[PDB]
Amino acid sequence: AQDDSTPDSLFAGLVGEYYGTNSQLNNISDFRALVDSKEADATFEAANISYGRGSSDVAKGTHLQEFLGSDASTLSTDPGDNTDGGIYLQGYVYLEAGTYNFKVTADDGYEITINGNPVATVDNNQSVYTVTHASFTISESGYQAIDMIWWDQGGDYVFQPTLSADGGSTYFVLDSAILSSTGETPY
Ligand SMILES: OC[C@H]1O[C@H](O[C@H]2O[C@H](CO)[C@@H](O)[C@H](O)[C@H]2O)[C@H](O)[C@@H](O)[C@@H]1O
Ligand SMILES: [Ca+2]
Ligand SMILES: [Ca+2]
Ligand SMILES: [Ca+2]
Ligand SMILES: [Ca+2]
Ligand SMILES: [Ca+2]
Ligand SMILES: [Ca+2]
Ligand SMILES: [Ca+2]
């Protein structure tokens, strides 16, 4: 919901922020502290949350643009170089009441929360790895609050957090079909 004097862009995606640093990102706490420490180095619309894979540091050159792919045309600016970097996404996702679970492929780590509750966590650096996370429940159909963090400490980078509504038989990417930046219906 609106919570200040600034009108908010309504689009079918999450509000994306990118942060770079020349310090080491080892875990979720490090990345969250980076987010807390300054304004975003760039903003974007996260409408197709399947990013990478690439090499040679997400925070260098045009690697962020390549990583974000179809979402990079919404970047507010082209960040300068850093050694380490990551993204913070926030907004809403339409989900019917029921049981769900994430399955996430990533390098490095990440955390996804729904309605404020962590539902997928990797609190460390890693080369590309896929985790099938534990199931969670949605009590009431509608737009659920969601946020994500992901980072790259260096090297390769990928982030694809897929969701299953059918007990792990099929999974889907979070994209413009169901995302909303504000919780209003995007057209
Ligand atoms: O430790 C997390 C990183 O792992 C990889 O990078 C390490 O492993 C590579 C292959 O063994 C080495 O070449 C590299 O020097 C190591 O840092 C991965 O490539 C990174 O993206 C991960 O962040
Ligand atoms: Ca606002
Ligand atoms: Ca900030
Ligand atoms: Ca750049
Ligand atoms: Ca892509
Ligand atoms: Ca685009
Ligand atoms: Ca690093
Ligand atoms: Ca990496």
Residue numbers in the entry: 4 to 190
Paper excerpt:
MpPA14 (Marinomonas primoryensis PA14 domain) lectin is a domain of a 1.5-MDa adhesin responsible for a symbiotic bacterium-diatom interaction in Antarctica. Bioinformatic analyses indicated the presence of an ∼20-kDa domain near the C terminus of MpIBP that is a member of the PA14 family, which is a carbohydrate-binding lectin module widely distributed across several kingdoms of life. PA14 domains share a β-sandwich fold and the presence of two consecutive aspartate residues in a cis peptide linkage (DcisD). The DcisD motif coordinates a Ca2+ ion that is directly involved in binding polar vicinal hydroxyl groups of various carbohydrates.
Glucose, GlcNAc, and other glucopyranose-containing carbohydrates, including 2-deoxy-glucose, methyl-α-glucose, and two disaccharides (sucrose and trehalose), all bound to the Mp-PA14-Ca1 via their trans vicinal 3,4-diols (ionic bond length, 2.5 Å) in gauche configuration with a dihedral angle of ∼60°. This interaction is further enhanced with the diol being coordinated by the side chain carboxyl and hydroxyl oxygens of the DcisD motif, and main-chain and side chain protein ligands from L11 (Gln156, Gly157, and Asp159).
